[PDB]
Design a protein around this ligand. Sequence first.
Ligand code: DBC
Ligand code: DBC
Ligand code: CL
Ligand code: CL
Ligand code: CL
Ligand code: CL
Ligand code: CL
Ligand code: CL
Lengths: 572, 572
Amino acid sequence: GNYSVASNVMVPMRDGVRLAVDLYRPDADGPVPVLLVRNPYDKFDVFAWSTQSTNWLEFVRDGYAVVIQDTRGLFASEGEFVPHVDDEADAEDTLSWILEQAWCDGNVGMFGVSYLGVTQWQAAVSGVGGLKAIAPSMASADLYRAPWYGPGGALSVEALLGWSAKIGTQLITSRSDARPEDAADFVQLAAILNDVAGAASVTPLAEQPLLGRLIPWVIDQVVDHPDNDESWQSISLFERLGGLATPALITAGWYDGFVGESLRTFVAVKDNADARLVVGPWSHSNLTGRNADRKFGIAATYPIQEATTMHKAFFDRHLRGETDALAGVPKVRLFVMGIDEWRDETDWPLPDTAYTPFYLGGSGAANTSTGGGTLSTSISGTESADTYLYDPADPVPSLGGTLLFHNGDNGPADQRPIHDRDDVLCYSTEVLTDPVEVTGTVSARLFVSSSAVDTDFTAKLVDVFPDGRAIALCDGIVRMRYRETLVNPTLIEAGEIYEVAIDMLATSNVFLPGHRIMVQVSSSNFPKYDRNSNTGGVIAREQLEEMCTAVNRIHRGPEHPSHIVLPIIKRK
Amino acid sequence: GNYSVASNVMVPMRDGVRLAVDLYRPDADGPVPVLLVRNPYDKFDVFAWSTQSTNWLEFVRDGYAVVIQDTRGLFASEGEFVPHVDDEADAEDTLSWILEQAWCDGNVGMFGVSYLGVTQWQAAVSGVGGLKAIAPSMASADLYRAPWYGPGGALSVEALLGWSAKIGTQLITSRSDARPEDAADFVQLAAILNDVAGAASVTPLAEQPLLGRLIPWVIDQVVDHPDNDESWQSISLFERLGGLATPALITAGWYDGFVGESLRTFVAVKDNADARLVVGPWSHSNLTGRNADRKFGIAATYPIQEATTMHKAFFDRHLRGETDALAGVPKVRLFVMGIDEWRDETDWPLPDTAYTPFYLGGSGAANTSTGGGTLSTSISGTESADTYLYDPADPVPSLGGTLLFHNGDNGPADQRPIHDRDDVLCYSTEVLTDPVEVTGTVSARLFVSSSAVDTDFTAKLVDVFPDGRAIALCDGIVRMRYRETLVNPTLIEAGEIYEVAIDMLATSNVFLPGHRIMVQVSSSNFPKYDRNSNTGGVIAREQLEEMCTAVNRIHRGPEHPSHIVLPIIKRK
Ligand SMILES: *C1(O)O[C@H](CS)[C@@H](CS)O1
Ligand SMILES: *C1(O)O[C@H](CS)[C@@H](CS)O1
Ligand SMILES: [Cl-]
Ligand SMILES: [Cl-]
Ligand SMILES: [Cl-]
Ligand SMILES: [Cl-]
Ligand SMILES: [Cl-]
Ligand SMILES: [Cl-]
């Protein structure tokens, strides 16, 4: 039950650069199992991240050692900081050092959230036999796909500018000797964080005098590489995951920026080792279960003590060889929205999933929420088309969804403020008499045309309540040059009809009696994603005046059966 | 920089009952200064409260010892738990034990929030010379005045039922051997926490089968004692504060349940010792600076590292005798709303405060926001009166303000949802051409009459924005039987006019050009306060059908000059 703490122990890497760690070690007569956490936000500052993870001092009281490390070039560590590029090698060297110590029994694991989760996948590909289990929460194994770009090939601009300002702020506050420019730089960084959409609105997007000076990576890597090219593929771990046999405890949230990539990692590792999955209704910075126009109940609040119990059982099985430690623990545990209840499952995707088309239709134009747009399981009878103007100077504002830094605390947001826009097309079912459950991955297939040689298309799933609230669920985008591949883009021909897919991530929701199922279609969602210039040019290098408007069209009928694909679950 | 942790050290009280503590002790050759925290929410669970306080492991790395204690009858401690009644004696005995240890140098201090703050005032009155400084955040020295009743003599019913359910929940989860009834009790407690207004609506209020069984104190002490009688005066510390000479670092929030009582403690101790004050725009459970319809900026987020630096300087001065440790630190630091900026001051109340009457007036009736009610620095010219019906079956709903457990995360709430009610009287200034600052304590003087022998009157200060948002600032209530004293109540005569005072707590706000100053007057605010029955009976023992409606009247003019008193600050 007792322990000691040693601060700033210096660990040498292969190139001679030393990284700083803190050691939390139990009172014990011999060696013990060990857990590692790799952190870019100061190893000393434990209260900043721990409330989004576990009550991990319980692990120490129960006989585990815990090691917390400052990553390269930050706080007490030597070297120079660049995101992602040094973390594979630095993790390998750190695991090796731990295994060589007098107090380590040969069994090592990892846990943590966000960047503290990404670094676990980077450690897992090293081939170090002593690493017996990992637990990555709200994370990704492919950095292009989340959080910097996405499956549709658009830049996640609010995520990039917000995070870069956060990193810049801590660099100034952590300086040994203050610089003359520090005071003014601090003020400017606060202005970005108070107004992320404003920061994202300046053209050309690639000209960032403050952020480019403090963290050159923001332009040199992220903005300058819009294709999923060799620079991205190098830091990706995903294709290596299939060859591993390492147990993983994976956590995600329905309104979290990482949700699509978190779920993919579970599917990639489940066949070769013991994988577990937990998904709640959270966004990256709001784990409370409470939002402005939607409350999920006290059961929805991040369950930190239950999480601590589950993590300890998982590590007891895989690090301590206790064969019955996970008795009674489910493989998959989901918070099902609508009914607003936790429920156990045997697999993800769910076994009895019926992937069902809901077709776009209706009399007259589908523009605005008072138009005639419908959704039905029957193919539409008349050939029709809905048309709108997309102007880059006036994009559709982002409201909820998977926002990270710009208003990122209201995932299930009411959509009524944007329903009167002519560029927002709406399609709804009739009012439901019986419940319909949608749990799984979601996508759309649309037949589209444009006056331009490049543009974007968006789709958003919505639950309409009896009182009028139109609550967001999941959404996605396709940038037309990347319609067939993220690696080798090509332009389109003006006026020609194309069939395209939109990846809309995932959800779990029961649409209750008295509700409607609704879909919104458009060509922008700003600043969740950057805006298309409609020119075919290098988007981030263009002035707002260099950009063009586009006349865009959605085709629907017997020969052009545009639809959403819903993962339907029926439980009697 | 290094330290050790010893768990479950047992400390004997005067009656032989032992309380459990954890010891965080630095590597040191001899004795050190010591800080104590007294906690009813599990000493092991440090992440639950610490994010609302300080990064206190810095204190340990810098050479302070820290002691965290389970209070009597909870978790690892022996005995039986009853709120407040054992904490004076238990603190005295604990301080004495610390001073007798080999590792203590004779200097002791305290820090912490909420119940961990109340317990510091209970320790301070003990007369133990070794206690050199305290730091109570979001706390009170008079438990009737906050959080259970108030300066107006109404029960804070949502605070009582919510907290009692929280305490009940942790008792079940902490049991050694589970009871057959535990599973069902847990479900019922969750239902209260998901619907606090619903729980508060059941009549008679005093019949609480679940909460009365788990924690008898809820009825035996709180509900059964509506007068500020001998049972309350016994646990009060306030009158003893004037005779102390102990330095205190006091923190408060403008939307916090404890704000009035926190500020009073500063005024009580400032003349005899080194007192300091910090006030931000927070509510008890929302320290982010972000609300549904009002954002204060990133500077408003609870500044935990600056708080840690200030606490360490304060303890260095008073526990380590470092005379220049507080050089450059202000006596008072306030977040001024409107301008939304931190500002330093020399005293509270502010030196140049002009306590200025704003008189109620207008042509026609003041009922609803579209009535004719006005506010002016000039006394009204015509004798008039505004009249309404107050029905206990339909009280005015609580929206923001100082709510604790029922929707307690939206202090600066938009008031428009209640503006069409006939029982909500509205009075406003013209649109402002120059800024007006209101910083200090706030109160109202009203001339009133009723058809009943008892009733309530309420008043609420509001900032009207250019777009229409009507944002709540501070509010209060008077229960008519307690108009002259909280100790010895008397009834009123139907139809007679009385001049009464309403204590509206405190605020700091600049009303900017384009805004208006507004006041709302009514007879209810539920469930922030319980509802008056309008009978003169024992309110908590009455059925809803035993209650009466009341016709209430506000008088205004030259002979009845009803007004609000605003603390005006002018800075050129
Ligand atoms: C986590 O710590 O927050 C960031 C959100 S963009 C992310 C960067 S990989 O890690
Ligand atoms: C703090 O811990 O929260 C409670 C809000 S009513 C309060 C009880 S004295 O202490
Ligand atoms: Cl809701
Ligand atoms: Cl549940
Ligand atoms: Cl049709
Ligand atoms: Cl605002
Ligand atoms: Cl400021
Ligand atoms: Cl008048």
